[PDB]
């Protein structure tokens, strides 16, 4: 009632694209416990890395690392099908516990990060500093990462749909679709949002008949 313990910077994890995903927002009163469900980036993926971040920057590399841990024992499945629940728990003593539970396999991996960990009062105000200074550049980096993920989705999603189709797809359409996927997969390698959107345009137009088949 005269003071509060609060988190001075956001706390979350690295997700696909090297983006920070926030679990506990800046200026939250401790104690506190928040959960979110994540999944696997690629097929038959046996493990995830849980990289813990403190900071307000969107690029994971621009935030302070507090540690990372693996959870393995993820049973083979399509990507985005496994449920990896991540929980950030800060108790009254200012300790952050982070868990990852595979909701199928019941398995679990924690890390404990002392109250003393992370950036000091000075480094904090610097971080808030750069966040506002590089809001623009961070917005750009985000909507490129979103584009890259939309592309990747569209790419993997189409390839699967091409196999389930088999003989059902006209040779012509397969030739044209496979060319666009090869060029998208190339574009995804690079940093040029416009060019990824261009290969995503090229696919939509040539894939019209493949889509129909997926019925």
């Amino acid at each position: 009632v005269l003071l509060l313990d609060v988190t001075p910077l956001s706390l979350g994890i690295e997700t696909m694209g090297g983006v920070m995903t926030t679990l506990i927002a800046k200026n939250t009163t401790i104690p506190t416990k928040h959960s979110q469900v994540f999944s696997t980036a690629e097929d038959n993926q046996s493990a995830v890395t849980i990289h813990v971040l403190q900071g307000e920057r969107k690029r994971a590399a621009d935030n302070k690392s507090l540690g990372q841990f693996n959870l393995d024992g993820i049973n083979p499945a399509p990507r985005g099908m496994p449920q990896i629940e991540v929980t950030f728990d800060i108790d009254a003593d200012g300790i952050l516990h982070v868990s990852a539970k595979d909701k199928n396999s019941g398995k679990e991996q924690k890390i404990t990060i002392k109250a003393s960990s992370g950036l000091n009062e000075d480094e904090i105000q610097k971080m808030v500093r750069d966040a506002e200074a590089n809001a623009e550049a961070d917005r750009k980096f985000e909507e490129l990462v979103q584009t890259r993920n939309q592309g990747d989705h569209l790419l993997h999603s189409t390839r699967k749909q091409v196999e389930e189709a088999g003989d059902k797809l006209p040779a012509d359409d397969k030739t044209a679709i496979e060319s666009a996927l090869t060029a998208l997969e190339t574009a995804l390698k690079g940093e040029d949002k416009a060019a990824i959107e261009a290969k995503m345009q090229e696919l939509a137009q040539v894939s019209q008949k493949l889509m129909e088949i997926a019925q």
């Binding site: 696909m16 994540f38 990507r79």
Partner: peptide, 5 residues
Amino acid sequence: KNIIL
């Protein structure tokens, strides 16, 4: 390895 929503 890597992780997504």
